[PDB]
């Protein structure tokens, strides 16, 4: 039994090349075949790579698959990036002890059409409303911290949605009892975007 | 020509059984594996199992713990995914896919999912028609910043106020001041 970890988001301008890597937690990545699936918005997935590096008919050669045993990773490389490649990509392998299929968490590939934008964060104070707005690419990670202890219960986060200006917006809600609000000294919303964290506290 | 047709969307409630289908057209249904992939809204792909319809030989994900059944009727070239008792967590899109197998340039066989259905959307919510409660619209079903579909099955959004919910016939004008 193993896991396949994938970056949440990657981005690049049209025409250049991107790589999405998929690290296996235990055992050799080269002991079991690796497949890569593509899923555009509102569409069913399709296989772009199978058996590590084989491409099904109709998939161009700008898509290529590789295996690095030293890092225990598989990689999907897309050259000559086109706007139609914007999509979620998934790696997948097999666990022979139970014949199970293990999938990666998925990676959203955005083809940069406009300059990157940092997220504007606003934390309203029981339900805490962390509004995140006017950011590009459309991928953020929200983390709620009560003082110093992490919290993952009672969190409802939107999926980023295209704004009117072709930028993205999202919102997170942390539901709590009035006692939880009055008990702690402060709560904090942390928005991670392109490796930069914006933290607001109340 | 070859296609997989999945049953239409289903909106059910907890405790209801369910049985969704996946019929293959244009090929020998009984000689290819049919796999079921779950995708909960806004999340990643999850493999739930496989059935070889020729002999109805089935494989399951370790994490199903008997909740669901994967079956087949090859007289009508159909595969089935079945729930005895639905739960809110089962809300998701469910794809079926054919495991194609051809011969490579080496003379050996290879397998991969070449053919997909459009997916059956299964919503499992207890939410009844309710009116709602900057401003913070809270718990309003059915819709209509985009709204979050909370774990309670109800929607909530925020606008940065005059709110109108015709499904419940609720018009509320709130006055915001420090």
């Amino acid at each position: 039994n193993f896991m396949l970890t994938q970056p949440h988001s990657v981005s690049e301008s049209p025409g250049k090349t991107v790589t999405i890597s998929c690290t296996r937690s235990s055992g050799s990545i080269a002991s079991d075949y690796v497949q890569w699936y593509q899923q555009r918005p509102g569409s069913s997935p399709t296989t772009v790579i199978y058996e590590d590096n084989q491409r099904p008919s109709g998939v161009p050669d700008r898509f290529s698959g590789s295996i690095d045993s030293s890092s225990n990773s598989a990689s999907l490389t897309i050259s000559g990036l086109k706007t139609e490649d914007e999509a979620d990509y998934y790696c997948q392998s097999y666990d022979m002890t139970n014949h199970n299929w293990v999938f990666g968490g998925g990676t959203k590939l955005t083809v940069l059409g406009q300059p990157k934008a940092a997220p504007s964060v606003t934390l309203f104070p029981a339900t805490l409303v962390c509004l995140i707005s006017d950011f590009y690419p459309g991928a953020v990670t929200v983390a709620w911290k009560a003082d110093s202890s992490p919290v993952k219960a009672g969190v409802e986060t939107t999926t980023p949605s295209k704004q009117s200006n072709n930028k993205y917006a999202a919102s997170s809600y942390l539901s709590l009892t009035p006692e939880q609000w009055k008990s702690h000294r402060s709560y904090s919303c942390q928005v991670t975007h392109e490796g930069s964290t914006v933290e607001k506290t109340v | 020509e070859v296609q997989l047709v999945q049953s239409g969307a289903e909106v059910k409630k907890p405790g209801e059984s369910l049985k969704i289908s996946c019929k293959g057209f244009g090929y020998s249904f009984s000689t290819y594996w049919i796999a079921w992939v779950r995708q909960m809204p806004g999340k990643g792909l999850e493999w739930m199992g496989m059935i070889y319809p020729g002999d109805s030989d089935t494989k399951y994900s370790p994490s199903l713990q008997g909740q669901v059944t994967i079956s087949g009727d090859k007289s009508i070239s159909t595969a089935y995914l079945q729930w005895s008792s639905l739960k809110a967590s089962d809300t998701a899109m469910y794809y079926c896919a054919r495991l194609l197998n051809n011969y490579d340039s080496s003379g050996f066989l290879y397998w991969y999912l070449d053919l997909w259905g459009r997916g059956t959307l299964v919503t499992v919510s207890s939410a009844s028609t309710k009116g709602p409660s900057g401003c913070l619209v809270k718990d309003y079903f059915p819709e209509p910043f985009p709204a979050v579909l909370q774990s309670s099955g109800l929607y909530s959004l925020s606008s940065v106020c005059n709110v109108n919910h015709k499904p419940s016939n609720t018009k509320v004008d709130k006055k915001v001041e420090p």
Binding site: S31, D32, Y33, E51, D52, M96 | T31, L99, W111
Partner: peptide, 16 residues
Amino acid sequence: LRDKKQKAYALFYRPD
């Protein structure tokens, strides 16, 4: 032991 092809056959192969 089994290479990737033998594992794929063990997973999916069916005699016809």
